[model samples]
Target: GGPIKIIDPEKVSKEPDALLEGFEWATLDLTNETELQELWDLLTYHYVEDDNAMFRFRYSQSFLHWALMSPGWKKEWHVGVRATKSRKLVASICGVPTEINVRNQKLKVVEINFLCIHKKLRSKRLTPVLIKEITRRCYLNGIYQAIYTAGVVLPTPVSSCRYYHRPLDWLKLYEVGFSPLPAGSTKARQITKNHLPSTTSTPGLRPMEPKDIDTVHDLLQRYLSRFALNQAFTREEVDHWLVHKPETVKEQVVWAYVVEDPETHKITDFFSFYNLESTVIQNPKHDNVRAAYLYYYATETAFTNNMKALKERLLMLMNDALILAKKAHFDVFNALTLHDNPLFLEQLKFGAGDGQLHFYLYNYRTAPVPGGVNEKNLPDEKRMGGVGIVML
Candidate 1:
């Protein structure tokens, strides 16, 4: 199946059908602490879990706010399902407005995310209704296209990317059952192999500040335009989405850094990663695993017209990023086979993860784009740079 036939809001029912018996739809107000906590609780207990049911995503409240309240965020799209009498939040599906370029054509779209339903409610078939309600809300707002990612393959996918993980705390990972020992390898050997330098070697590399927003925005926009599918972000959007605001916020959910030409004061390279921890289900030794995901980055070297130089530059910047994550006490650094990652993933020693994330488009049809993984699900240089857009 390709693009689903579109239904105009005028022809569609404004009020959705009542949920099966005891459930009712509720509009979520993320600004409210109690309601946000309800959402967080629902997701924390019942969100995405690994195939073997070993770990589940544990989204923090601050991360939820940062993700759901981006520029052009709408409260109605933050849909939820509640127990009619108890008034407890049981399920959720959310969307955020964004403009994306697909094959050089700019279109208004919603980035669909955080689709979660409680464990007990799955057999009730609530997922399809949640999806339909979110779609209806999007159409009502004149948005017909959406972008989402899932571990399971749906009817079709615009692209597919494999996961890679670089261990920052090998012992912690092994204890939590997330990493395995090689046939003859010792734990000490693994720890030594993953060691990073205490200090970053990249010149002028420092934490991104408010003053560098404009310059970083310009560099990122120009660099991202080289890809077939990329977000076209405004300056405000860039500041809200990428910049780390520690003073105004209670929790540090994201980390960003920029390389400045200290002499010229020019922003030459930018990279960022966000915190997403996983709950180790039933593990007595560990309760959670702190994970850092490669978010967005751009460098002037991509335009240098020399692949070798670009590769070297990325290796240096990303290696520094790994060191930074380790310093912050993250257990692992995870990245997708997107952007220019294929060039540095193997060299940086990120082993291929078991899961694969498939990218999909709603109510739209598009040809598949390369996602930087070869037949064996390993990093392949030939597939580099085909996927530029990264979803949360």
Candidate 2:
């Protein structure tokens, strides 16, 4: 176990007073170039880091736009804290409205993310106030339920999921200290181990188009309902999330693909992934790591009532996704041990990573859901189907 942060509760105040001195509350304007720049600088500089302090999140502008402005988003939910002196952006916490199906009950909830504070104000205890302000704003809009995720454990966790990575450029990862060599393995051997095909094998698999939105939505609705917790996507939301827009599409944030059954002339499968990079700090050779995170995917095999057939179908789809990711020059492929991931994690050479994501629910309570892990916290097939919502 790692060392824990020691705190003396007697010295803690019941209300936050230190945060009110020089900071003032404000709402962020997403489309305003200057406001967006300030928020970006705050997050990129102080909002993220690895435990080892050698890596940090590299969230891009396009990524921020896509993640924050989902279908029912409101400007009031884009909460922020500004400096009283020069009105410089100092902190932020944003929320977006989305519906979720939890334990057979559908509820409209807010998905909160990007809670951050500037580097200069650490230990001033501004986090609680930021959360309270965001909560208050959401309540004004009649949203009582909410969901969020964290790298650290909070009051409680409904599910704790682990990160698994499949290195595409083995040598680069090794050189950047992201990957280590095995005791008896050589560099070339590791490269061969992670090698992927240049072309995808699944026939009829191509970029998802707007025309396939309705069918894809129907297919995903059936598949996602199998899980204990999942997002309920509308057809418009499906188009917004899955369909590619090359041209505010500054940087590519998401990639979606579909398989059209040649004979049936129908869409049979769908899968999507998003790009989230990590800035390599103090590295001699590399400046960043391009990571492709596995997102939502589903196939018709799930209804076949055959375990082996479903497993085989999932493997093929994942392998082809890897090929496509590699062709796009991603250094590594990342996934959480959620959904049906345990079915293929080990089979596909994805190594367990140090990072773990824990999911939290606010203002509502339900039984603890399986996070694709056993009591020992290792991935197991029987422990899936409990967590299906993916937080940005």
Candidate 3:
């Protein structure tokens, strides 16, 4: 069996314009404070939420700037809809251009994200129209494929990943009802169990700098090639995605670090995490919950061809990552069962979360790639390393 056809881009190279009456299509310039604010308000009130309605994603302006402004990002793809009468934004979808590799084929593809519709417009059927317009725009730019993830499964998914959470500020998470007090566990015990060292344990670990870009790009390229589906990040892309330029932005969005072997001064490992907050719905005590999401990571140990060694090294590196996250004041750490995460999820005390995000490809076909999950939807070491692309 091969990859199923979801939306045929070439065929949709043949599609329409025109929005629903009383609404008009608006191509938002993310740099323009006015337009960016409108987009923010549209998503802030009506975007994704957990099943219990206890939380909703609270994407910051800085986070949006970092995410949408990837190298070569275009203004046309920041599609939005505004009401004709009030000129208030009501719906939106956006994508950034990137090259991704499937098996051994490298293809330029659009990374689609932030598809949102106003709460009142849910029944008005605006989703399909938004998807259609985005497809047409992407096809016009010669991009025939797209990659995206969703909490809900659509027509198909190439791989499905499960969410896992490791508490940082255990009391804060408990206070917001984000993490429950276990059946047999006490609050003090829970806090003790989730505790991390004040400082990172990994030797030679240091913050990534501009001087380390080429080295990291090379290391990451060799590392990511091990996956069947992963990004093909250029050196420039690496600089843009991995570097945190404080002077250029108001709020910090990413934290990246690297391990340089003191003996020979060669980079041996790398890891990163990005900040995203969730609005605690109706909680007077806590308005937002800051989460550090595990991003890209790589290690030379993966080349050892020794599974046990790779596992142990990964655990140490990620544990240090947790330490760094907690140091940053993140309330929790979140990850999906992707990359080599299966090797450490349980050992690191990450509890399985209720959410499952499905990864899908548009107008592309290939065999299903492992998503670090077993038949029962549990993390399995045997299913490690197929998906290497991380979406925001």
lDDT (C-alpha, whole model) for all candidates: 0.90, 0.86, 0.90
Candidate 3 lDDT over 1-392, as tens digits, reads 33345445456544457788999988899989988888888888999999999999999988998899899999988898889999899999999999999988887889999999999989877888999898888877777678999999787688999999999999998999998998998999999999888888888999999899999999999999999999999987999899999888769898899999999899999999999999998886899999999999999999987999999999999999999999889999999999999999888999999999899888787878989999999999888768999999
| Cα shift from native, residue 312, model 1 (Å) | 0.2
Against the true structure, candidate 1 reaches a TM-score of 0.97
What is candidate 1's lDDT per residue for 342-388, written digit by digit as tens?
A: 99998898988998999988877777888988887788888765678
Report clash pairs, candidate 1.
none
Q: What are the TM-scores, per candidate, against the unseen true structure?
A: 0.97, 0.94, 0.96
Count of clashing residue pairs in every prediction: 0, 0, 0
Best by TM-score: 1
Candidate 2, residue 66: CA error in Å? 0.5
Per-residue lDDT tens digits for candidate 2, residues 4-121, read: 2323434443332335787888889998978888888888887778899888898888889888888988999998888999998988999999998888788888998999988888
Question: Who is ahead in lDDT, 1 or 2?
Answer: 1
lDDT of 3 at 146: 88
